[PDB]
Design a protein around this ligand. Structure first.
Ligand SMILES: [Zn+2]
Ligand SMILES: [Zn+2]
Ligand SMILES: [Zn+2]
Ligand SMILES: [Zn+2]
Lengths: 108, 133, 81
């Protein structure tokens, strides 16, 4: 919506941003080499609250997305969708007019 | 925040800026010295000191289409041993760099004086900041 | 054909083309008025003078203009390994 009208000034940086706090998040993270959210359970650190929140689940068994078929736990919707698509007849015969459909790619 | 440690960072940040130029308001914004007037005062003093000690140079840049829209910027010089963000305007050709070193007529009423400069300025008009200044 | 170098996004080349190539008087005055009467930093990169950021250029590039003949031979040499 609103136009990108805050330009990073550093040598060899191309980026422009919508609102000045975001330009500052970029500058402190990329160019100065500082981060604002530390893991309690390992050495790593993160640039956003949502990124530390994802990393915190990785230290735990009670992972926040749970499979509808097998009940395996995962941390975000992309992982869930890819995993659940393995519980489907995903693959299709690529050859002309052939009707068949398959569950594991080596079968196809 | 102890500004005495940050002077090296201010010189290195300006040194790493495109063509060695950075807007002073944008530099305050990067280091987050904008959170409190206490931090603002510390930053303005530091920039002035680096200018006086000749590590940096305060310079103006002038909008090629508007002499009143000028940008306060710091220019890099050597290593340590009006408030609108203009990072938009600095994207143009904008080559009007300037390193740093009243018309009031008693007899005619003020009405006619603003009229005369608003006329003499032509079809491009004049801004209130030009008229007052 | 000789080695070809593209100057489309080199700041000083754009200033030269738009002045000495165009013959536009507004551009020519702006250009000569910008040439220093004497140069105090002939050791530093020309980018420090030419502020224009509309062009992507690394500060490792001194905007060195290219020679009029790079291939000193018009035909391939006989290396043959
Ligand atoms: Zn950047
Ligand atoms: Zn961790
Ligand atoms: Zn599952
Ligand atoms: Zn088939």
């Amino acid at each position: 919506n609103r136009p990108k009208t805050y330009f990073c000034d550093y040598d060899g940086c191309d980026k422009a941003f919508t609102r000045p706090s975001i330009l500052t998040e970029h500058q402190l993270s990329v160019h100065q080499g500082l981060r604002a959210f530390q893991c309690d359970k390992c050495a790593k650190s993160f640039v956003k609250k949502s990124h530390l929140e994802r990393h915190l689940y990785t230290h735990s068994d009670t992972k926040p997305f749970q499979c509808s078929y097998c009940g395996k736990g995962v941390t975000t919707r992309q992982q869930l969708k890819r995993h659940e698509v393995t519980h489907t007849k995903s693959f299709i015969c690529p050859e002309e007019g052939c009707n068949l459909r398959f569950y594991k790619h080596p079968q196809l | 925040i102890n500004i005495r440690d940050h002077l090296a960072t201010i010189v290195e940040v300006v040194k790493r800026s495109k063509n060695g130029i950075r807007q002073i308001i944008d530099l305050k914004r990067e280091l987050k010295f904008d959170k409190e007037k206490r931090l603002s005062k510390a930053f303005i003093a530091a920039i002035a000191w680096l200018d006086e000690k000749e590590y940096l140079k305060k310079v103006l840049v002038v909008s090629p289409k508007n002499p009143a829209i000028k940008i306060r910027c710091v220019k890099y010089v050597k290593d340590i041993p009006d408030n609108f963000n203009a990072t938009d305007l600095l994207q143009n050709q904008g080559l009007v760099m300037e390193e740093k070193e009243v018309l009031l007529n008693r007899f005619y009423p003020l009405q006619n004086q603003t009229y005369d400069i608003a006329d003499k300025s032509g079809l491009k008009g004049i801004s209130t900041m030009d008229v007052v200044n | 054909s000789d080695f070809q170098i593209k100057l489309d996004n080199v700041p000083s080349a754009r200033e030269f083309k738009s002045s000495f190539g165009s013959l536009e008087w507004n551009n020519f005055k702006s250009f000569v008025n910008s040439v220093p009467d004497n140069d105090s930093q002939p050791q530093e990169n020309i980018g420090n003078l030419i502020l224009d950021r509309s062009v992507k250029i690394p500060s490792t590039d001194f905007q060195l203009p290219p020679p009029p003949k790079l291939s000193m031979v018009g035909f391939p040499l006989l290396y043959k390994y």
